Amino acid sequence: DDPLQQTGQLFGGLVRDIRRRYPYYLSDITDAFSPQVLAAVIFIYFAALSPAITFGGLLGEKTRNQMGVSELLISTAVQGILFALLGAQPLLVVGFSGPLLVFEEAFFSFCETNGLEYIVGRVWIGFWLILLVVLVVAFEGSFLVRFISRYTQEIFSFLISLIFIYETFSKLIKIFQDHPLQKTYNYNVLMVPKPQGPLPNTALLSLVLMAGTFFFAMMLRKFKNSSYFPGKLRRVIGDFGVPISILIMVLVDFFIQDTYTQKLSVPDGFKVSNSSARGWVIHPLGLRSEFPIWMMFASALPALLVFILIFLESQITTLIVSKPERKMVKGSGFHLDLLLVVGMGGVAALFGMPWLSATTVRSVTHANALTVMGKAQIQEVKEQRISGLLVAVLVGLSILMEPILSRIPLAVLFGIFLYMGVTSLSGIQLFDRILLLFKPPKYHPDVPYVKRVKTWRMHLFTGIQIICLAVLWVVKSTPASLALPFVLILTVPLRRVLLPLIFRNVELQCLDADDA
Amino acid sequence: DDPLQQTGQLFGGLVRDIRRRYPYYLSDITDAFSPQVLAAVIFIYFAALSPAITFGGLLGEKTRNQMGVSELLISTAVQGILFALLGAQPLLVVGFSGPLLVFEEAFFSFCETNGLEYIVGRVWIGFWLILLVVLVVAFEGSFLVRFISRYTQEIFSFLISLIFIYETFSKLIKIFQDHPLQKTYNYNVLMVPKPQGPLPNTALLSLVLMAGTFFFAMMLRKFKNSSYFPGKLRRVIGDFGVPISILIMVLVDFFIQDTYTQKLSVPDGFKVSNSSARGWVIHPLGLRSEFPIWMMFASALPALLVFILIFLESQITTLIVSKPERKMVKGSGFHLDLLLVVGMGGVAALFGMPWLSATTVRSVTHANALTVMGKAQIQEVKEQRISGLLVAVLVGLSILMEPILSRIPLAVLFGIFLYMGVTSLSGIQLFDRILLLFKPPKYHPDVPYVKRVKTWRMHLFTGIQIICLAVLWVVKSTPASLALPFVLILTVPLRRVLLPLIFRNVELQCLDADDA
Ligand SMILES: CCCCCCCCCCCCCCCCCC(=O)OC[C@H](COP(=O)([O-])OCC[N+](C)(C)C)OC(=O)CCCCCCCCCCCCCCCCC
Ligand SMILES: CCCCCCCCCCCCCCCCCC(=O)OC[C@H](COP(=O)([O-])OCC[N+](C)(C)C)OC(=O)CCCCCCCCCCCCCCCCC
Ligand SMILES: *[C@@H]1O[C@H](CO)[C@@H](O[C@@H]2O[C@H](CO)[C@@H](O)[C@H](O)[C@H]2NC(C)=O)[C@H](O)[C@H]1NC(C)=O
Ligand SMILES: *[C@@H]1O[C@H](CO)[C@@H](O[C@@H]2O[C@H](CO)[C@@H](O)[C@H](O)[C@H]2NC(C)=O)[C@H](O)[C@H]1NC(C)=O
Ligand SMILES: CC(C)CCC[C@@H](C)[C@H]1CC[C@H]2[C@@H]3CC=C4C[C@@H](O)CC[C@]4(C)[C@H]3CC[C@]12C
Ligand SMILES: CC(C)CCC[C@@H](C)[C@H]1CC[C@H]2[C@@H]3CC=C4C[C@@H](O)CC[C@]4(C)[C@H]3CC[C@]12C
Ligand SMILES: CC(C)CCC[C@@H](C)[C@H]1CC[C@H]2[C@@H]3CC=C4C[C@@H](O)CC[C@]4(C)[C@H]3CC[C@]12C
Ligand SMILES: CC(C)CCC[C@@H](C)[C@H]1CC[C@H]2[C@@H]3CC=C4C[C@@H](O)CC[C@]4(C)[C@H]3CC[C@]12C
Ligand SMILES: CC(C)CCC[C@@H](C)[C@H]1CC[C@H]2[C@@H]3CC=C4C[C@@H](O)CC[C@]4(C)[C@H]3CC[C@]12C
Ligand SMILES: CC(C)CCC[C@@H](C)[C@H]1CC[C@H]2[C@@H]3CC=C4C[C@@H](O)CC[C@]4(C)[C@H]3CC[C@]12C
Ligand SMILES: CC(C)CCC[C@@H](C)[C@H]1CC[C@H]2[C@@H]3CC=C4C[C@@H](O)CC[C@]4(C)[C@H]3CC[C@]12C
Ligand SMILES: CC(C)CCC[C@@H](C)[C@H]1CC[C@H]2[C@@H]3CC=C4C[C@@H](O)CC[C@]4(C)[C@H]3CC[C@]12C
Structure with a gap:
């Protein structure tokens, strides 16, 4: 009963992946009914949204707002919903990653040099990605993942965890660089896009809000493992350790009146980031100019690079999450999940939305958020589809619930990322x-x-x-x-x-x- | 071999206290030769100095600078040296306390109401204190300390520890009240005695410097008990856990250029705080006016209150420090230590310097600084006279080494007091x-x-x-x-x-x- 085995028939692995997991589908709804699953939804929501705002912003800067925050929130939502309902490993969190942003910057720079429409060039890469994955899934190419040992898994998983921590500290340093500790500050600085000059108490409060959130989160993780209060109350307060830590430090920031802190900023409404540049549906043959015939064939080479990036990232994540060490019983599918992630990514490119990948730190955090602890040893993991589905819906509705998010400082979420980064270094x-x-x-x-x-x-x-x-x-x-x-x-x-x-x-x- | 036993002869307990401990005097010098004793001197120095600056300042405000920081540093030094050399329990730290400050404020207010010389009135209380202790020590009144059980000891020891913690947090709150988090601040505020108005980044940096010092101190205490690095290096870095924590956060503050933090402030030179009011030697009969004869007899009643305060504070401290639980072998003396503390206090009053007491948190910290840990159980305590003697000498020389102290923020020392207060709640x-x-x-x-x-x-x-x-x-x-x-x-x-x-x-x- 090994998932990574060649059957010797076309789409053999995919059929075996469906036949294995879909008999548990009733369990994958009912097993959601527990307060730990609600605690996971709230924690993984902020973990899933934050990148979609960050990378979405960077994409808007780099690609002249031809793909922005609106596009990435819509993609992360729709692919997140579809994957939660259809996927063989629902605990995988699907979203944008650093290597994908590096490619979009690269492919945009190439299209501007040669004088091509960036957003049309993506549609062709999208079509090749659908052709490549259907061919790979047909001939069962996911058997090669068997050769990827613990050696390569741990190097990869450790590298992502360290970079995730480094990235979190880089954001804190940037606030100190924007708002240095000076003797005298200029008053009546314009704040209509952002503070124009430096501000007093902004950098040191951001440090306190980060340090506070991390402290409370790590203290409430120790409290769960302790022998204080009745056992029932200890687990509930422990399960809601992150969302209690966030609520406290959001209220601490709220009651401080005069000092400025940077908050979450989502788009106005469900619109394209540059309406002058593009619409919702993109014509493959071209928008303004006739798209060249050579690139309609040459788009295979960029599509091959994008495939390799999404494959390595997603399949290594699936191994780390579905290890024998972690109590996973319902099973995993490397053929079905690969077809969905790359297939949806190819279709997503037709509407000018970014293709995504099963990201490691978000997937690992989600699995660690749903695992039960006995006595220290793991008893069970709450394997369901609801926790994944709900986070995808909330990321979709994040634009509508702007009033709630506007009160949440970014400094508070930096403390939560530090907690995620440190806590990810468990089974390695x-x-x-x-x-x-x-x-x-x-x-x-x-x-x-x-x-x-x-x-x-x-x-x-x-x-x-x-x-x-x-x-x-x-x-x-x-x-x-x-x-x-x-x-x-x-x-x-x-x-x-x-x-x-x-x-x-x-x-x-x-x-x-x-x-x- | 019970110290708290009536012999049935005049000065019986005192002779037994000397005959018991003074045969160990050679050991009480040689046992000082270890790096943990140097780590104790540096830690207990800042713990001993800080009150002498704080209370010394308050005394200067309350008694119209007739007794100030200079007077208290000189008293703490000379009594500290004499007690270290002659005392039966050298681990007791002798200094000023809250209840003594309450009395000086009260006795000053009384003398101003009735139109008497405050500093002369103290000389008579001083003479009564010498008469009372000599009478109590003669008839062996320290046998009554036997009736003070664990019940009263722990209530007292817990109350002082909680108040010490509360006092530390009150100082942090006062900075926020002096330097609030405002939108706009006034620049070119005069700073010649202290900042005249509020300042940006002063309160939040003070919070970071306190929190930083406490964190590092509590982390280095855990590291000592851990199984990381060679055993020799682990104990040395652990023993110097506080002085490493202080050095780090003093350097952190040093490299921050523009932001203001309040530093240690010692007197200019070895002078009386108000030369117009008094000199070094005080004439019992009076300075300006003829001191009344009724007050030369009525000074017995204030002397009785001061005796009771110094007795209860000092004797309860001696019980807590010299418990059977703590590995104390060289022994303690309740008769000799009482005669010194009250006797020196009476003589100190003649030179216009404050009488002191064996303070609990400083004494307990000093004993905890010198105790060895095995495997968790106590093996031995480094019982010597050098650690006590050296702290008393450094408090004396603190005025000369002002250049070093001027670089040390008060915020850093608040983190060290929080560590002392929490760590004191061990054997209770x-x-x-x-x-x-x-x-x-x-x-x-x-x-x-x-x-x-x-x-x-x-x-x-x-x-x-x-x-x-x-x-x-x-x-x-x-x-x-x-x-x-x-x-x-x-x-x-x-x-x-x-x-x-x-x-x-x-x-x-x-x-x-x-x-x-
Ligand atoms: C074992 C591990 C030990 C590590 C511990 C290290 C500390 C980790 C936490 C980092 C710091 C987080 C503090 C956030 C608190 C909010 C402060 C803030 O911004 O408020 C401004 C507020 C703003 O006040 P305001 O704005 O409401 O004032 C009223 C309005 N005006 C000004 C107009 C009049 O100012 C304060 O009064 C804050 C006072 C500080 C209180 C916080 C105490 C800190 C605790 C020190 C560390 C010890 C931890 C516990 C020890 C016991 C454990 C054994
Ligand atoms: C298990 C318990 C967990 C509790 C942990 C909670 C945190 C406890 C510590 C409290 C905060 C203390 C931070 C002190 C740093 C000093 C900052 C400062 O003032 O520098 C100004 C400096 C500026 O100094 P400067 O020298 O650059 O300024 C001069 C240069 N010009 C002129 C250009 C301005 O600001 C910075 O750039 C430094 C910011 C980074 C500070 C470090 C971040 C700390 C966040 C938490 C750390 C996590 C610890 C371990 C985690 C893993 C645990 C398993
Ligand atoms: C909206 O899209 C248009 C079309 O790309 C962008 O116009 C560009 O303007 C930049 C300078 O800002 C020029 O370097 C490009 O040559 C222009 N592009 C073309 C092909 O016209 C515009 O920048 C975009 N605006 C936003 C919202 O980013
Ligand atoms: C120095 O000592 C003199 C003598 O006490 C103090 O003079 C007092 O001044 C206050 C007002 O500041 C009056 O209320 C008192 O009546 C004065 N005392 C007497 C008896 O003259 C003076 O305040 C002291 N200065 C310092 C350094 O505090
Ligand atoms: C501020 C006030 C409450 C402080 C006074 C001390 C309080 C906390 C003390 C006084 C009497 C104590 C109670 C005495 C007896 C019992 C029964 C036991 O089976 C559970 C604890 C319980 C219920 C105690 C809880 C703590 C208690 C309520
Ligand atoms: C305002 C933003 C930043 C934070 C939002 C977090 C909210 C939704 C979290 C924080 C604490 C949480 C509560 C903590 C504990 C419990 C007890 C449990 O038996 C039912 C759910 C309930 C009642 C939680 C509901 C959700 C909750 C209120
Ligand atoms: C999501 C996108 C990219 C998929 C596009 C390829 C389509 C045509 C593929 C994907 C999954 C495939 C099916 C999966 C399972 C079976 C059952 C098997 O007994 C016959 C082939 C058959 C019926 C496959 C062929 C057609 C199929 C529907
Ligand atoms: C509510 C749950 C089930 C789904 C969560 C995602 C929802 C809120 C998101 C996902 C994609 C979004 C749509 C994306 C594009 C458009 C086209 C635009 O011209 C009108 C809004 C509309 C139609 C959006 C409405 C909101 C939407 C449907
Ligand atoms: C005002 C002066 C006396 C106060 C100084 C401290 C007093 C209490 C000390 C200093 C020297 C001491 C005495 C020195 C020698 C002896 C002889 C011995 O066989 C019994 C104790 C006795 C009698 C000592 C106890 C009391 C004593 C007088
Ligand atoms: C990370 C950067 C700075 C490169 C440094 C090399 C590190 C990663 C590795 C490479 C080879 C390693 C050494 C290989 C063999 C030994 C022998 C023994 O004594 C245990 C440690 C020691 C001495 C290792 C220490 C760590 C080491 C030096
Ligand atoms: C500047 C103020 C605030 C702090 C002063 C603390 C100084 C005196 C402390 C901090 C760290 C200490 C050192 C830490 C470790 C050792 C190793 C030991 O084998 C000999 C002493 C030695 C070398 C210490 C000497 C004293 C030391 C330098
Ligand atoms: C090295 C050991 C023995 C002593 C350490 C503390 C020394 C340096 C301290 C303790 C008490 C101090 C003295 C207290 C009072 C005065 C009176 C003043 O008008 C001149 C300075 C003088 C005379 C001080 C000089 C320094 C002093 C002697």
Whole structure:
């Protein structure tokens, strides 16, 4: 009963993925009825919205507002609803990511250089993405995901978690750079788009609001595991640990009258970001000028890059989420989820909306938000479709409920991202082994890679993984960032051909195991 | 070998106190040679100086600068040196306290009403205090301290710890009240005594500097108990946990250029605070006017109140510090330490310097700073005279080393007081039982008052102690604050006559035990 197995018939894996999960569909609605699932919806909502506002803004700056916040909120909503209802692993959160923004900036810059319509060029990439995924799913190409071991999974999962933390701290630093601690400030600064000059108390209050939210969140996680108050009340207050932390620090900010803090800013209504540039439906043949015939064929090469990015990101996320370690019983599908994520992305491009991917930190946070703890060991995970569906609906309705969001500071949400980033580093053995570099070999745990293998060998293995982690980081900030998936693919040969001639067969097994 | 035993000969207890401890004098110098003792000196120095600047300032405001910061630094230094060299329990820290400030304000107000010289009136109280202590020590009156049980000790020790925490938070609130978070501030505010108006970033930076110092201090206490880095390095970094926390946040404040923070402010040189009012030596018969003869006899009644305040404060501190629970082997003296503290206080009054007392939180912090931890259980305490002697010398030289202190913010020291206040609530069983009110009865810790006594009876006992704690608090803020020692004395009858008719003899033993 292994999902990653070649049947030997066209669309064999996809049929097996549907036949496996869809018999649980009744359970995937009823199992939602518990207060922990409501606590997950509220937490994952802010986690899911915040990127759609951030990246949506950056897309508006870069692509001359031809694709903006409105487009990304509509895409994240509709794909989120459809995936929650049809998907084989509903705990996956579908949304925009850094590598996709890098491509849109790149493909726009290319279209402006050659004098092409950016938004029409996306429609053709969209058509190729539908053709490629249907071909890959037909011949069962998701069997190749079997070769992606824990080695590549953990390097990837750790890299995203560290960058997510770095990105959160970069936002705090930007406030201090915008609103420095000066002796004298200029009064009557215009604030109609944003504060024109620096302001007093803005940077230090933002620090307090971030630090406050993180503290409260980490304290309420400890309280859940403690032995204070009746057991029933302890779990409920623990389950709602994040949404209590957010409510407190939003009220703290509210009662402070004079000091300025930056709040959430959603679009006016459900409109295209630049009506002069485009509409809702885009004509493949062209809007203003006749779209060239060569690019209608040459759009396969950008479509191949976009496919590889969405595949590697989404399939590695599905492995990390659906590990044997985490108590997942209902099952996962690599063929059905891949067809939906890339298929919807191709159709989305026809309406000028961005294609998305199953993002790691949001997916992991959602799974960690729904998991139960016993005694420390995991008993069960609340595997349903409702938690995913509701977050997608709220992201859709975020424009209508602007009055509520306008009272929420961004500083408060930075504290929640720090909590997400730190909490994501749980099941990653690479993180566990990085902490053993500092511990004496006296107090190291009693795990196989600690008992069976020598300490200096274990550390060398951890060392080679940190070098891989450093090289991937450099590739991601250096302008050659679109060629990360290919550099991440080279982690698979390293593990299978180069490590075996350094380390012994028994050691590689113990250190990198499938089931642990 | 019980210190609190009547011999039946004049100055019997005092001779037994000297004969017991002075044979260890060689050990009380050599046992100082360890890096933990240096870490204690630096921590207890700031803890000892800060009150002498704070109360010294308040004394200057209240007594028309007839007794100020210079007088209190000189007194704390000279009495600190003499007590460290001669005292039977050198871990006691001698300095000014809240109840002594309440008396000086009261006795000044009385002298101004009746038209008497405040500073001369103190000289007579000083002479009575020498007469009373010599009489009490002769007839061995410190045997009465035997009747002060754990019941009264813990109520007292908890009350001082809570007030110390409340006082620390009151100082932070005062900065926000002085420097509110406004939209617009006035520039070119005069800062020659202090900021004349409010300032931007002053209150929020003070909050960050306090919160930062407390965080770092509590993190470095956890690191000491952890299993990270080599054991040798872990203890050294752990022992210097406070002085590392102070150095970090002082450097953080230093590199911030434009923002204002209030720093430590010591006197110019070793001078009397008001030279026009008084000199170094005070003539008992009078300075300007002939001192009245009735007040030379009536000064016995204020001297009796001052004696009771210094006795109750100092002797309860000596019990809490020299408990059987804490590994104290060299021994304590209630007769010798009482003679020194009150005797020096009487002589100090002749030079116009304040009489002091063995303060609880400073004494407890000093003992906790010098105690070793094994595996969690106490192995030993570094009982010496050097740690006490050095802090007294540094408080004396604090005026000369003004350049160093001028760089230290008060906000940083507020974080250190919060750490002291929280950490002081360790051995107090009342605090332990207050936490069990929130825990369910199955998660209780295994101890006699949990196994032998029923849960509802244990909670009633904790309840009656909280009522005693509430009444004492009200008495201390309400203008009748000088009559706290008498209300604290009434805790002894309560425990011995009223509790036995409510609770059973077995229960009172288990809940309130001498050795546990
Ligand atoms: C074991 C881990 C320890 C780590 C602890 C480190 C602290 C972590 C938290 C970071 C700081 C977050 C503080 C946010 C509070 C809101 C402050 C604010 O902006 O209010 C402005 C408000 C604004 O007041 P206002 O605007 O309402 O005033 C009325 C209106 N006017 C001004 C017009 C008259 O000012 C204050 O009065 C705030 C006072 C500070 C109160 C906060 C206490 C901080 C606690 C210190 C740390 C200790 C933690 C607990 C210790 C016990 C644990 C064992
Ligand atoms: C488990 C318990 C969790 C509790 C954690 C809660 C936080 C507790 C600490 C309280 C806040 C203390 C922060 C002090 C930083 C000093 C900032 C400052 O004033 O610098 C001004 C400086 C400016 O100084 P400057 O030198 O650049 O200014 C001069 C230059 N010109 C002239 C151009 C202006 O501002 C900054 O740029 C620094 C901002 C970053 C500060 C750090 C952010 C802290 C957020 C939380 C950290 C998380 C800790 C660990 C998490 C993991 C735990 C598992
Ligand atoms: C709306 O779309 C038009 C069409 O692209 C944008 O017009 C561009 O203006 C920029 C300068 O701001 C020029 O560099 C481009 O050549 C223009 N594009 C074309 C092809 O006309 C306009 O910038 C967009 N406005 C918004 C809302 O961003
Ligand atoms: C120095 O000492 C003199 C003597 O007490 C103080 O003079 C007092 O001045 C206050 C008003 O400030 C009057 O209420 C008192 O009547 C004065 N005292 C007497 C008896 O003359 C003076 O205030 C002190 N200055 C300082 C440094 O505080
Ligand atoms: C205003 C924004 C920033 C925060 C919104 C968070 C809100 C929706 C959260 C914060 C605390 C939450 C409550 C916490 C605890 C409980 C008890 C549970 O048995 C039913 C739900 C209920 C009553 C929650 C409802 C939702 C709630 C009110
Ligand atoms: C979402 C978009 C991209 C999908 C477009 C391709 C369509 C035509 C594909 C996707 C899923 C496919 C079906 C999945 C399952 C089966 C059952 C099998 O016994 C015969 C083939 C059949 C009927 C497949 C062929 C046609 C099908 C509907
Ligand atoms: C309410 C739940 C079920 C769905 C949540 C998403 C909803 C609120 C979103 C998703 C996409 C959105 C639509 C996207 C585009 C348009 C075209 C425009 O000319 C009118 C508004 C309209 C028709 C939007 C209305 C709101 C909408 C339907
Ligand atoms: C992260 C950047 C700075 C690169 C630094 C190299 C790091 C990641 C790795 C590469 C090889 C590693 C070393 C390999 C082998 C040993 C032997 C033994 O004593 C345990 C630690 C030690 C000494 C390792 C420490 C960490 C190490 C130095
Ligand atoms: C005003 C002066 C006396 C106060 C100074 C402290 C007093 C209490 C001290 C200083 C020296 C002390 C005495 C020195 C020597 C002895 C002899 C000894 O066999 C019994 C104790 C006795 C009698 C001491 C106790 C009382 C004493 C007089
Ligand atoms: C500037 C003010 C506010 C803070 C002063 C604190 C200073 C004196 C403290 C902070 C850290 C301390 C050091 C921490 C660790 C060690 C290692 C030990 O084996 C010898 C002492 C030594 C080298 C300490 C010396 C004193 C020290 C430098
Ligand atoms: C090194 C040890 C022994 C002593 C440490 C503290 C020293 C430096 C302190 C304690 C008390 C202080 C003295 C207190 C009072 C006066 C009177 C004044 O008109 C001149 C300074 C003088 C004389 C001070 C000099 C410094 C002093 C002696
Ligand atoms: C501000 C006031 C309330 C402080 C006075 C102390 C309070 C908290 C004390 C006084 C008497 C105490 C109660 C005495 C007896 C019991 C029965 C036990 O089975 C549960 C706890 C309970 C119900 C106690 C709870 C705490 C209590 C109410």
